[PDB]
Amino acid sequence: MHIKSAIIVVSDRISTGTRENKALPLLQRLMSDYSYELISEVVVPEGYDTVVEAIATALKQGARFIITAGGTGIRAKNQTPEATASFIHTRCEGLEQQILIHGGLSRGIVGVTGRDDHAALIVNAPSSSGGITDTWAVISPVIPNIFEGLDA
Ligand code: NA
């Protein structure tokens, strides 16, 4: 089971190059042993339009697992959750809750874009490495179950 995957790092400073993209190599380590096939990775500035464009592009390219890092706080430009919600068919609020139980200002969501074997799972992680590892700890074990359900 190859899961076509995309990473979207959301950060003004990484986008311009004045800050290191630590999320990408960390996510690649967490993904490396089903299997994840990384078809796309990008860095975008903060905002609604930039995140929407990145998600819609990854979905068009066939990604079925999209993980974002960053843009989940309360600043005006922190619009990752809002951008993400525009694509969601069904939220996985239990998983959001577990991420919080396992790990307050992150508004990151988790959800799927449909209910069938074309649907994608989108997960918003925080910018921090610790926040990414806590998100991953909750999502990783349930990935097989999500795709088995969508693909039934
Ligand atoms: Na964040």
UniProtKB/TrEMBL annotation:
Pfam family, one: MoCF_biosynth
SMART domains: MoCF_biosynth (SM00852)
Ranges where the MoaB/Mog domain occurs: 6-146
Biological process per Gene Ontology, one example term: Mo-molybdopterin cofactor biosynthetic process
Keywords in alphabetical order: Molybdenum cofactor biosynthesis
Pathway, per record: Cofactor biosynthesis; molybdopterin biosynthesis
Superkingdom classification of source: Bacteria
Protein name, per record: Molybdenum cofactor biosynthesis protein
